[PDB]
Specification:
- The complex is a heterodimer of chains A (about 300) and B (about 240).
- By secondary structure, chain A is α+β, with helices and mostly antiparallel strands.
- Chain A has helices at about 85-100, 115-120, 125-130, 175-180, 185-195, 200-215, 220-235, 240-255, 265, 270-280, 285-295; strands at about 1-5, 15, 20-25, 30-35, 40-50, 50-60, 65-70, 75-80, 105, 140.
- Chain A is elongated.
- Chain A has a domain at about 115-300: Aar2, C-terminal domain-like (Serine Threonine Protein Phosphatase 5, Tetratricopeptide repeat).
- In chain A, the strands form three sheets. Chain A has a five-stranded antiparallel sheet with strand order 3-2-5-6-10, covered by helices on one side.
- With about 240 residues, chain B is of the alpha/beta class.
- Chain B has two domains: about 10-165, Nucleotidyltransferase, domain 5; about 165-235, Acyl-CoA Binding Protein.
- Helices cover about 35% and strands about 20% of the residues of chain B.
- In chain B, the strands form two sheets. Chain B has a six-stranded mixed sheet with strand order 7-6-1-4-5-8, with helices on both faces. In chain B, strands 2-3 form a two-stranded antiparallel sheet.
- Chain B starts with 16 loop residues before the first strand and ends with a helix.
- Classes of the chains: A alpha+beta (about 300), B alpha/beta (about 240).
- The interface of A and B includes residues 168, 169, 177, 178 and 181 of A.
- Bound molecules: 2-[(2-fluorophenyl)sulfanyl]acetohydrazide (2 copies).
- One 2-[(2-fluorophenyl)sulfanyl]acetohydrazide (WBF) binds near residues 56, 57, 58, 156 and 158 of chain B.
- Chain B: This is Pre-mRNA-splicing factor 8.
Chain lengths: ~300, ~240
């Protein structure tokens, strides 16, 4: 069990850690988060009380270093940092733990929600989507645009998700125009899976990461990517049976976790109605279709 | 964006453009089988691709053999249309290729866009206009060449005859659309109007009769009456 200590909390802020969140009052006795489960990526995220504009946060994996948060009063945000002096970091955390100034990652034993949402998400791939190589953790916020969004403006601050475009030469083989547009299997299996992602695990990892950035930061380009990656599978007549079964599990837990009152802005009516009721895989997503129909029957 | 009444003069500027109408590509007769079921029988069709500034009509004849053994023919017809329009553009010299292709039905947009990915600078546009190009198969010489075809064939027609010698392409298009609307609203009346006087003939190399300017005014007036007439006969006004 690892710890993301905080030097202090000088401004009032709602802090999230994965799917949990709590309020910290200005100058309240806060020194961080303990008992963080090892083996998963995690995200620690922030919304200031005085400006709900800009949710922002950091993806990290405690196996890759010792990380702490300190408020920067010049740039006006909580920043993650890496302490290289292991001896000093472990020593400081112990004093904070002794003073009972750290909140406990509040995981119920029965509960596999976080695993299920991050099963295929690896830090190494996050860092290729979010490029800032001098750090072991990755900053994301509500406003960051995607590379594809920038083709339709600061490159160093972009989300380099894999570009998916159904009306592109990459997606459409010469002489198979109708076939490839109406049945996207070539684009899914040859171009994307064999060619770019190499395997379905990396595809699902990017899909899961896009969903989580959409949900936690309201990142619009990430929501676009999530839906595009769903639609590419659902619009393919030929998908490996294990990928369909896994997709149904992935989406089930995403829909289960989605806050009810954010569905209107995080769910695309066309994609979901097409995926569940018109597409080749309209009958392959039993768990997802059942939770969608019982939780969001208006959208459909 | 979309082409409509407000931006109508754009049709006659000097940017090459084509209208594509797919209405008459997939044509069937519906009939009873011996068992009393219903079946379709295809007949030859055509793509109507028109340069509205010059009157150049590229009439690609769609022979019924292209449907043999194929499924979902109404959907295939849109993709076949887009394949043939794409082939036509590729066949033209660069300086003759269109800068815009306007499709008369919105369901042609995605098929044509996909077939034209190699031409990212050619705009594919819809229209809000209800253009009467379906009635091209009521022009006798066009109908004849489509029905006589035994194989796929491209036939070339100037749909304005020699009108541009005497009128502008705005006025020619307006005449064409009036004639075709009339033929679509009441084919028999419209054809009676056009061919009632045996002394005005259709030249061998033309589609329409050789009316004088004065006779065209009368003709156009009679076509407007007809479209009002039938509009009352239909709506009881
Ligand atoms: N200049 N930065 C530091 O002196 C703080 S490093 C640190 C180490 C362990 C626990 C918490 C911490 F904030
Ligand atoms: N009969 N026509 C010609 O000999 C060439 S002019 C032309 C060119 C393309 C389509 C329609 C046309 F009338």
């Amino acid at each position: 069990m690892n710890t993301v200590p905080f030097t202090s909390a000088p401004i009032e802020v709602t802090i999230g850690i994965d799917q949990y969140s709590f309020n910290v009052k200005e100058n309240q006795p806060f020194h961080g988060i303990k008992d963080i489960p090892i083996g998963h990526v995690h995200v620690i995220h922030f919304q200031h009380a005085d400006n709900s504009s800009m949710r922002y946060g950091y993806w990290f994996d405690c196996r890759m270093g010792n990380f702490y948060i300190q408020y920067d009063p010049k740039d006006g945000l909580y920043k993650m940092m890496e302490e290289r002096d292991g001896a000093k970091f472990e020593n400081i955390v112990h004093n904070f733990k002794e003073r009972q100034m750290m909140v406990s990652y509040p995981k119920i034993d029965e509960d596999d929600t976080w695993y299920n949402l991050t099963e295929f998400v690896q830090m190494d791939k996050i860092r290729k989507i979010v490029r800032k190589d001098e750090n072991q953790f990755s900053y994301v916020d509500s406003s960051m645009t995607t590379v594809q969004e920038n083709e339709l403006s600061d490159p160093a601050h972009s989300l380099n998700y894999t570009v998916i475009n159904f009306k592109s030469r990459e997606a459409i083989r010469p002489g198979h125009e109708m076939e490839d547009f109406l049945d996207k299997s070539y684009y899914l299996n040859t171009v994307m899976l064999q060619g770019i992602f190499k395997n379905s695990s990396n595809y699902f990892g990017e899909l899961q990461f896009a969903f989580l950035n959409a949900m936690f930061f309201g990142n619009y380009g990430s929501s676009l990517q999530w839906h595009a990656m769903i639609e590419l599978i659902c619009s393919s007549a030929t998908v490996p049976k294990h990928m369909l079964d896994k997709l149904d599990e992935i989406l089930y837990y995403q829909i289960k976790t989605l806050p009810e009152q954010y569905s209107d802005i995080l769910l695309n009516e066309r994609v979901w109605n097409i995926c569940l009721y018109s597409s080749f895989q309209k009958n392959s997503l039993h768990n997802t279709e059942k939770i969608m129909e019982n939780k969001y029957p208006e959208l459909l | 964006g979309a082409m409509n009444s407000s931006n109508y003069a754009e049709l006659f500027n000097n940017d090459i453009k084509l209208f594509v109408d797919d209405t008459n590509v997939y044509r069937v007769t519906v009939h009873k089988t011996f068992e009393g079921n219903v079946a379709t029988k295809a007949i030859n069709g055509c793509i109507f691709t028109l340069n509205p500034k010059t009157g150049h009509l590229f009439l690609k004849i769609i022979h019924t053999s292209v449907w043999a053994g194929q499924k979902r023919l109404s959907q295939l017809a849109k993709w076949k249309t887009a394949e043939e329009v794409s082939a036509l553009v590729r066949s033209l010299p660069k300086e003759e290729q269109p800068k815009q292709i306007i499709v008369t039905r919105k369901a042609m947009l995605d098929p044509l866009e996909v077939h034209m990915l190699d031409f990212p600078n050619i705009a594919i546009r819809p229209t809000e206009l209800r253009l009467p190009f379906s009635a091209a198969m009521s022009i006798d010489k066009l109908s004849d060449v489509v029905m006589k075809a035994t194989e796929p064939q491209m036939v070339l027609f100037n749909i304005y005859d020699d009108w541009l010698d005497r009128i502008s392409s705005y006025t020619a298009f307006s005449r064409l659309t009036l004639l075709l609307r009339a033929l679509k609203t009441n084919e028999e009346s419209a054809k009676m109007i056009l061919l009632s006087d045996p002394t005005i003939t259709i030249k061998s190399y033309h589609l329409w009769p050789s009316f004088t300017d004065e006779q065209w005014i009368t003709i156009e007036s009679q076509m407007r009456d007809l479209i009002l007439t039938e509009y009352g006969r239909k709506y009881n006004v």
